[model samples]
Target chain A: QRLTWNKSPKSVLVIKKMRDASLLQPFKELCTHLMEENMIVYVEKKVLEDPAIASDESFGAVKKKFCTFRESNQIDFIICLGGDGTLLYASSLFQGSVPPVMAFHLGSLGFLTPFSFENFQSQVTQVIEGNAAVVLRSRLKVRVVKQAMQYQVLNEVVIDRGPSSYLSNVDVYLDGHLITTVQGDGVIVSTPTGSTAYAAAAGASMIHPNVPAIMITPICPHSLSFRPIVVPAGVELKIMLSPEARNTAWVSFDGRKRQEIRHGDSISITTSCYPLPSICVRDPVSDWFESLAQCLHWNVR
Target chain B: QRLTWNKSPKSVLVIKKMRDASLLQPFKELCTHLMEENMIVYVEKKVLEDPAIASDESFGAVKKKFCTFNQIDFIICLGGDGTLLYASSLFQGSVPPVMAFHLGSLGFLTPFSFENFQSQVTQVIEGNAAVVLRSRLKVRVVKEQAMQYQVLNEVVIDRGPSSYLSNVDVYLDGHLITTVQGDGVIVSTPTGSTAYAAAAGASMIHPNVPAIMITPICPHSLSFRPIVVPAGVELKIMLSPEARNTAWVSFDGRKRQEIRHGDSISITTSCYPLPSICVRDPVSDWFESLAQCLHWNVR
Candidate 1:
């Protein structure tokens, strides 16, 4: 997509998780008005392949003009009609600089999705016109320091024991310096934005999203002294299977795709050059706290 | 006695635990050289009380400094790590870099020795010392938001003699974070990582890392491991209103006080960190101390 981040965008592509039928009614309303108003609305070929939705000539013409389906497509902005899942789906489609995302709270639990559908008609203009706040949620850029393999994740990347009979032995490094050898189920390298997700469940503090830091949390560490630590942002992190480890490790991208990581191969992770921005309801700071108290019920004690 | 720490002090106050009487002759030898060189030597009001040392008009005239004295440029700790802790206890404000000579059993915090005390002291006096900032946690017992009893190292809240578990609520930067059901909790600085926090199963963070740690002692849940938070954040751990028994807090294992419901203990990075003079540079010295003193990573 065109790297028109922070500035106002002229186009928007809507993304959604296709599981719910309740999503259809609003999906029709969003496209009909956005297309009729002469605004650019992008859709994928498969999403419009449904005869029920594509039979309308108004959205069909708009989709034909606006649709740009690959990483090569220059998407100005992204609007998610459902839950955090839809937001993740949107991120998966963009490997480079992501246009700001506006997520609607349509799922049962919407920690990442803060917008409501009630005012979707009017609020859509306010977001595009720049009345909203932009929270740059950090992303991890992972590269095989040995191989050319690389991946990017908006949330977290997990390195865990992949059905190994022995405990996972991973040597963690910080800024080219040896830190520790974690002998446990695995180690979780998470961003401040992902602190509330898997990191919190694994005994890590839920850091404010504004904090520029990374959290390294060991999953079921054998050492009783292995407390999760928060390091300054921009530090290069290297995680590889220790030389003495009995088995290989498994690496996953945002908990979706899993692959094997052996002893010789290592993954180097650092803050990405491009940060994903979210158009916020109440500035990024307030909206994140609201999500913590409302959706996750964190800090509810 | 008010805790007053002397910064880059010209005069040196020598400190040693009373039990290490063997330190007397060598200490006397070190003292004569320092004094003959016209360095202002501040000895304990009690140090010269012993008749064993050969003393003159100057020894008799030595400033009768005591445990409460903090006017010296720096301090010389001549015993184990406890003596260094004793020196730290004397300081309420910023502590000068202490040249500690390890003479006791537990030697993690104390890394120097008396083998070449004279030359080491000379290098220190001439400003050729490697000083590392060992951060101290400023802990206060906040009773309904009123602060009191500022202490260092770690503030430990225990269930006390009562068998009931010490139930408490932990808050970070004004948000209620977690609830701990255990015998007690230890809130420590990076320097305290080697002490009780390590014994409690919390990670041994390097002293240079700007962070504070909260460790649970015999916590009820296995999943509840210790957590490390940024140094700038404030932590308020209050006795849960539902707590069956009261919890007591200790500052560096002293100043033990009982706190009840509605009272809270707040922790943050101290304005003053113990400026410990390193025999080596920051990183290597820490590793060397760990290996020598704790037998860490020794297969």
Candidate 2:
């Protein structure tokens, strides 16, 4: 849906915990300007208690002014002031009707964040006026089935040996056929966007951001000849512990939630029905290519 | 090396050939009566040439009188009659060392003739002999700069267009750096044993065959993945003319050699130097496997 800027500004959700006290002065000034201009700014109560933003006198007064904030159905935009991980965490809080995110570069090696703290005001103004483009990255839907419980993962799902020294034996199956028995430290099932994160270290092939495929790469396989394999999107992948497995495996989602895996448990993964829409400062290809070149120095020969 | 059977005075090589001609009747009759005596009977060339030997010869004459014919330098056991392709075509006339091969079955699937047709003949005879195993496969090593080639194909080599339907640009350093242009192909060196053949659908992975690598599956791009990359092999691959001009490209050992625009090449695979000596059979595994399975249907 096309964004309309003519309507009066309703609400702007700011992840206040992400900004520090030194950076809080400019953020409070920006929020005060927006509030005086007849725009309603929404701040979570838990976020205001954060020492970074709460300790600042200017932000304290600004937080007191908007103390009675409610969950408005119409959030105009989301200004995330942290790294890509923080942006992803904040974006996950929104359901299907997520507002566009304008991220400020704050983390180490920011691939998603484009705007710097110096240009935060201008970038926020541009985003509020609906002049920015939104690039949507596909998210993976991961389901772990243990005995009777099932959990869904948004970013990536890892099936690895949590604290055990022994290698995990994972039996992978594609369309009911036994592909191979993976004897490794673990296996990573990542979305195309997550290919560069953990999967890259495990020798997974680099996939284009727009390509619709699931990458399955093993982490230090027992057999040196085993290579990575990529399956098409919409195909259901089932990874289960081998019957003769000696060690327990664990599951993690976006490196946040961790769960213990019992023997014979299965982890199923497929493409998620919803996509995370992130605001882009430049073209997706040009921006991603530049990031890859500058950040990773890809093909430097 | 030629075999000298000293235990038995009657060699089985000459008798088998004479039995095929239906001769050696008088020799067989004498063997039945003089069973207790060690009578030395020899089937000369004239007797073998005679039509009387064409009659139903007894198994004794087939085994004793005419089996062992000529005393040669070495024996070339071509397992099946058809396996004579290796003896005739691959080994270059088998003149430097003439070896008599034992065709395991009733087919001409071997390069040389057999003396005794038995499953376990080593226990029946007492002798000291030395056997050597050699790789029987060939490779077509083409000097990339000069089209002048050497035809010894142990493994298949191929190049094709990329999966994106673009010309495959291949870069050659020591290994694959990045695909320069189009799709990627494969160069199967000889060391790639048990690949491209049997599991890979090219030919049987002839054991103990010393030939360069084989390239079986050639994919176009990232979507198409190749198989069986052997270690410790040096390959110098470059883009050929076909890959430079046409959209798709591929090459085998013999004949069908063409290149398009953006096509690259890689080669130089050394043979797997390990030798797998047969316990009883002197012929290499390729001839033995074909003679046992392909021709005789042992299964």
Candidate 3:
């Protein structure tokens, strides 16, 4: 099955990094242009408080736009106006299906954002007119035990000691079979698309996003010979704090929803059925290698 | 597509580390039992020169039996992981599914224990076992012409027997990547990841993943770190023409050769992959070997 994308995006959902106040100008510039072209734009509820947006006469129409917007509201695709975090935030909002995302490089370590902000109008216009490539990045569907809460993560799930001094002792199981006990700061279970993030930093191999695989990397493990391993995407991984450990640990989903884990608690993670469609400047291969070379200094001396 | 093995292999190649000397007694016994079942067994030319094997009454008949064998259906490795590495060198193109015994130094590659060799053979004789497909590299050194070679673990290019820092220019797909001004460089597969790459401060990668690791050995630049790339790319490394010295190359720790200035080595993933028959399944066998041999993650 081919990964399909929105060939002609009539409506756009704008999600941006909120902390950087300077983004207000470019954000308004894009919004005003999008609105002027008779395109439906949905802004986050918090973005409404900005003075530039409030002062604009179109703020009244934006208010009318928010009331009609819901999860079911059919938007052509998403336009993220910040770093990788902005895209992660967009993915968290849409539960089952995620529209194609056009991410802009507005900050550092911009692996997900390939398009530059120099000429945002023309670059965005190319994407909206279906003159861009589309790449599908797989996500991890994580379900926390006892909490009955589920989260979707684009990068990785970090199971680490929050502020504890002791080593984190966790038993990792694959497909209900005991694999090994990770005695380290924590462990990172990431998708192939997230290999360059926490997994690569933890001394795991950097895998290309196209492969349907999952990576498990130990962070500062006690054993000297602990090597990272990759498992087939079909397997379900279960991680729990070992009963013999003296201290508890914390788990985070893409740097969000930090929580504690008791001795008996377990976390189950698997490949999410819904993959995120990312609009690419070129094709999948070129976009990934370009970002790897530029953003991470991947092969530079 | 599933990787299937010959359900009932008729011919089996037996390889061993003869230096152990103790493995001789049991090795001969296993061969006799296998031949009794009307199956063909092949030992290296050196192994067939064994005094006991030479004095046997049916030696000529067994030598005649070897002539009828066309293709090797499976291979049984004895001694250690190095023994398996030796077995790999024996076959130039396609290698038969190998079953390595944990009888040598570094059992990371050798998964099966030799406690019950007979029963293990019986289980293996029956089919449908999982295997670990380990990728290898096909390297060629260009002088005025190209010299092709293969490596299962790694291809190390360094300043061999020279005191001056090794100098080489690296290229990826015809584009300049890096210039090394240190001891040397290592291009290894995931199978060789935990072997030399780990010792050189590189990360350990799973063998199942289709990727290669490039680690610089004592690189001059402090910022230079190991990097991983997809297996499809062709990496070209040449001795810097303006360098103080030339470089040496080795494939799987053997066949040490020298390359002077104006020479380049081109490396890419090989079309052939080694299939190792696991004691358990591919996943379990690899994890168990890590824990049992390397004490990985063991407190």
The numbered model that scores best in TM-score is 3
Number of clashing residue pairs in every model?
3, 87, 0
DockQ of 3: 0.34
Question: Which stretch of 10 consecutive residues in model 3 chain A shows the poorest summed lDDT?
Answer: A1-10
What is the Cα-based lDDT of residue A223 in candidate 3?
83
Writing each residue's lDDT as its tens digit, candidate 2 over A1-301 gives 2345577556877764344554466567667866876777877666666776656665566676664334445676677766666566665566455666767765444566766677566666767764667666667766677754344334467888876767877787765555567777888887766766677667554444555556677788777545554555666778888788777788887787677777857777777776666777665544554555455555333
Q: Cα deviation of A222 in candidate 3 (Å)?
A: 4.3
Least accurate 10 contiguous residues by lDDT in model 3 chain B? B61-70
List chain A TM-scores, every candidate, in order. Answer: 0.90, 0.85, 0.91
User: Given the true complex, what DockQ would model 1 score?
Assistant: 0.13
Candidate 2: where are CA atoms >4 Å away? A1-9, A16-26, A33-37, A65-76, A95-97, A107-109, A147-154, B1-299
Prediction 3 TM-score vs. true? 0.88
Q: What tens digits encode model 3's per-residue C-alpha lDDT throughout A1-301? A: 2334435457788887886777877787777778777678877677666666677775566456542346554876788888878888888888678888888876564688888888887887766663677767889988889566888888899999886767878888887778888886888999877888878788776666766678888889888777777776666898987778878889998888788887778899988998988877766666776777787776555
TM-score of 1: 0.71
Q: What TM-score does candidate 2 get on C-alpha atoms?
A: 0.50
Which of 1 and 2 is ahead in TM-score?
1
Query: Every model's Cα RMSD, please?
Result: 6.4, 19.1, 3.4
lDDT of 1 at B133: 76
